[PDB]
Amino acid sequence: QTQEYTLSHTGGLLGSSKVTTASNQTAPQRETAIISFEVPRKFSEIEYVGQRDATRFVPRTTEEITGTANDDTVVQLQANIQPIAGEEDMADQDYPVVVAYNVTQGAQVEIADVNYATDEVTLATDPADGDTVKLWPIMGDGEVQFRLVNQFGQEEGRVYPWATPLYRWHDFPQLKRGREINLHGSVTWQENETVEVLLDAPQAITWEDADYPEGQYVSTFEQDVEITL
Amino acid sequence: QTQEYTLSHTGGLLGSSKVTTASNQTAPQRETAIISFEVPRKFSEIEYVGQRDATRFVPRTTEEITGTANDDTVVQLQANIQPIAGEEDMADQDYPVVVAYNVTQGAQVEIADVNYATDEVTLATDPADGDTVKLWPIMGDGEVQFRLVNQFGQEEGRVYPWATPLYRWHDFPQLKRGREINLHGSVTWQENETVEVLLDAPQAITWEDADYPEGQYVSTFEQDVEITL
Amino acid sequence: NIGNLSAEKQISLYDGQPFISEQDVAAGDPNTPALTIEGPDGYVIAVDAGTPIAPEFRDSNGEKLDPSTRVIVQKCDRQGNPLGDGIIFNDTLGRFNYNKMRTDPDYMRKTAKSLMVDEREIVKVFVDVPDGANGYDAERSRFTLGDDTSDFGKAVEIVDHDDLTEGETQAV
Amino acid sequence: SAEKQISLYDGQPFISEQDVAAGDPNTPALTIEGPDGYVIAVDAGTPIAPEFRDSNGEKLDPSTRVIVQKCDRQGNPLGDGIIFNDTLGRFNYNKMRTDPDYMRKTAKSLMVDEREIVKVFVDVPDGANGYDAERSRFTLGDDTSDFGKAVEIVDHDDLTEGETQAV
Amino acid sequence: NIGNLSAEKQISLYDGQPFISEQDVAAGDPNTPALTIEGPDGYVIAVDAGTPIAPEFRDSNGEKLDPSTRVIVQKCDRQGNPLGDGIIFNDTLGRFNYNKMRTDPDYMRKTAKSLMVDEREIVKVFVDVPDGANGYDAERSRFTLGDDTSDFGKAVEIVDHDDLTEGETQAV
Amino acid sequence: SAEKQISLYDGQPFISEQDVAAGDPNTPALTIEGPDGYVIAVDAGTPIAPEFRDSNGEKLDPSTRVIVQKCDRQGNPLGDGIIFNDTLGRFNYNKMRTDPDYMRKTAKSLMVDEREIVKVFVDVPDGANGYDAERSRFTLGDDTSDFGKAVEIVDHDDLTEGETQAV
């Protein structure tokens, strides 16, 4: 009676009550938690198996950039940027590495060119004085791990002690058999034995802003599982 | 070649370099770390054994209280107070539950009476307008645990999953055979397999202020061990 | 490194835990429990013939209530139902001498007999205030059932239900 | 088992009480009385909490005396069989309720059949305040504790030595 | 619950680890290693006959250096001493096609042979820039040795020295 | 018998002392030293009265530490063989001199041949008052009492295991 299933950063098999989202600590870097997975009312157990099971995670940050009469068109970011699957050609990245949106003009802000490893960007358009823009570059230079909870907060420990980096995460092209991710670890957790992902990085994270254009959800985490009903 | 020894919040067998002290997180309660124990250059190993080994921990917080022309003599504290061993009679507490010190007058500030579980205090003296006073009540309403590190930050896990509270810590009279503390746990850690104590509480902690009267060290942690040389 | 441990684990319960519960109480209302311990799932807890209690039960003004007050610990099966066959610690209040009895072997006060608590069974702390006295509060009060830190006093013995082949027998 | 460990006090049904005046030792302030089908037993030593205060909530004169005494039927005192001839000005209430050594044990053991009385006579000699019960209490046991003893109650139905205990 | 694991663990090394080291390099200076891997204590690490590398080695201006550039991985015993009998991955730079070779089986490039690293043994990454080219930087560069996430590529095999009865044999 | 039960302290000849300054743990404040033809012995547990006060007659900072330590000849500290690594801010002098449980026993046993040194190093870390000895005392035993232990002195002349104890 074992059937594979999929999870999400939102609702799904949990109703947005047996799951939470959360930002992270930045000023002191801390291996904080951003997302949990509580077993809901029904299930007997859940199973994760790295080296058999998949994973996806698309993280982005947020900032705020004004404008000027003699606007710059150019920005710098304190969050290292890389491509995802190959070149930095925004047309063919398999999803963009940057998103932008003007606030005054409730409209997108398209990109002209990127200063690649400089971590600076050139835009296509010309913002105005005192005009606000919101950006959503991807998140790199940060670790990730899994762990577990014994119904209170007493951790069993961790799935697999060694971490994994996010620039690497972006680097490996998702959506390709063999080139998929398959971590290491093998676990099981029954009712209220919640799981929590952890992240250690300087920079922030963003799940929602209510002004992000592309589908209400700035980032995501998605995952495969093998459930006993 | 096994000999028992003692540790401290300061130096000793570590030279104040293989040990650190630290405050905690308050606004978000986090089970943070306040103190570590790195194995120094020399030893082959260290051993802790709850139910055989002892412990002492005297925590205090800090605040800042001005004064007034029609000074109050009275204070309230957002940190629950209890006795240590028996009554709240400051003469015979086995160490005070409050310390005070005026800053303008570089002198102590003696206590008249305590509103016990109200978490308010009456003083003996009369402060002045704009006059600063520093207090150091004890710390209660907080957990504690131990854990371990694999030379990087990859935690093995924890000594004993269940926590312990600090009001209880104060309650049990230190300095009495049988009535001593003996936790649960049994561990070992070699060179650079550092240990870290953890604390989860709302309130702050204080190790030093450089103006605390009684011996340069506001709080302490002290502990017994069984060392292989 | 860490040393291995058994399934049996020695603890000491108290007020500020999640699975325990509580409530305030008024005078002359014994059937209103001030503490409701409640078995977590996938766990059993055990109490031998004698284990201490620290029955701190103070007033809103942080004063121990009348010595005529009485405490009754009581086992309860499911259904939120009291039970008589199976009961611990019928005592007054005015007998503990809190400040010492949390510590001293002689002032220490143990149970009447042993006990076991399946994954879902309740225990209640009923409090007979005589009448016309001061009301009870819980935030100004504490409670315990074991002395696990010490070396002479006993402690509560918890086990996870999965780690037993006698689990069916202890379920019966 | 049928045996059970208990500790008595004032606010119970089968027990009874009454106020007392100065210089009237024959007036029992407490009257214990065997229930039906419930034998009880007291070994050679068991605590008592002889709280006996004034209307104004004050322990009476130290020269006051307490005499526990067995009684058969007929409401009748008995000499062969007596426990706890003692003063009042001796107990140090606040501590003796707790400590093992300020504690006070009986002279000898006892049994109480289904209908047998016990009385607590109180010799206030003279020149004293009258007794009240509502401002006073009493006990006979500490079953809660470890070092101390308690009263052993049994239901008469679950025995075959009931006739022997009736003799 | 957690599932048990073996002593052997599959990983993938890179720049931003503590026990690895690095430094910048100038043109025409092959004997100056840009990466110095160094055995931690109480650990052994193992590399089978073929395991990938991601030899990203860019300029200060974030550009891969001249294709005439060359990379030499090299085992080193203690004494900080290079060794010839025992050497891996003599290659150019201008041959990787970074953007794909981190991913694709065909562009993937493995070692020449196997390897083992005791508790204290060094490995060095020497870089022959021909001359007169752009200087090397490390912060604008990365490096790997394994593909542990994937399913076709190999990975580095770490073991703790305590968990072996053949530890004396692998010490010899 | 040749064995005798004693308890040491400051004002003795063979013992020695010296004042100490803050942040100088290598300066021993007390130097015990084997007399000639008088072996002594300390079992696994014996009291100490580590009174260590200021010039102004005040116990130094609680963060202060005491380390008793054996020393062979050459005025030389020794690691294999050490007793009583402890703080200062712990003893509660006025009671620990008397009570059995505030009392403090050694880590392990000890012997001291005719010429062997023991030192009492004192880690005052910093920011503290200097040490004085005249306002301070010390002990190692309670031979007067019953529950507690004491030091076992023997004259070397009255033995035949003297060579074995010299090894």
Folded structure, characterized:
It is classed as virus. The entry lists the keywords vertical single beta-barrel virus, internal membrane-containing archaeal virus., virus. The entry is titled "Cryo-EM structure of archaeal extremophilic internal membrane-containing Haloarcula californiae icosahedral virus 1 (HCIV-1) at 3.74 Angstroms resolution". By secondary structure, chain A is mainly β. Chain A has two domains: 1-59 and 140-229, no CATH class; 60-139, no CATH class. Chain A is 3% helix and 27% strand. Chain A is built from one helix and 14 strands; from the N terminus they run E-E-E-E-E-E-E-E-E-E-E-H-E-E-E. Chain A has one helix spanning 166-171; strands spanning 2-7, 32-37, 46-49, 55-58, 74-76, 100-102, 107-108, 111-115, 120-123, 133-135, 145-148, 186-189, 195-199, 220-228. In chain A, strands 1, 3, 4, 12 and 14 form a five-stranded antiparallel sheet that branches. Chain A has a three-stranded antiparallel sheet with strand order 2-13-11, with no helix packed on it. In chain A, a hairpin with a 4-residue loop joins strand 8 and strand 9 (120-123). The longest helix of chain A is centred in the C-terminal third of the chain and has 6 residues, at 166-171. Chain A is elongated, with a radius of gyration of 19 Å. Chain A starts with a strand and ends with a strand. Chain C is mostly beta strands. Chain C has one domain (1-172). Chain C has two helices and nine strands; from the N terminus they run ββββββαβββα. The chains are: A mainly beta (229), C mainly beta (172). Chains in contact: A-B, A-C, A-E, B-C, B-E, B-F, C-D. At the B-C interface, strand 12 of B face strand 1 of C.
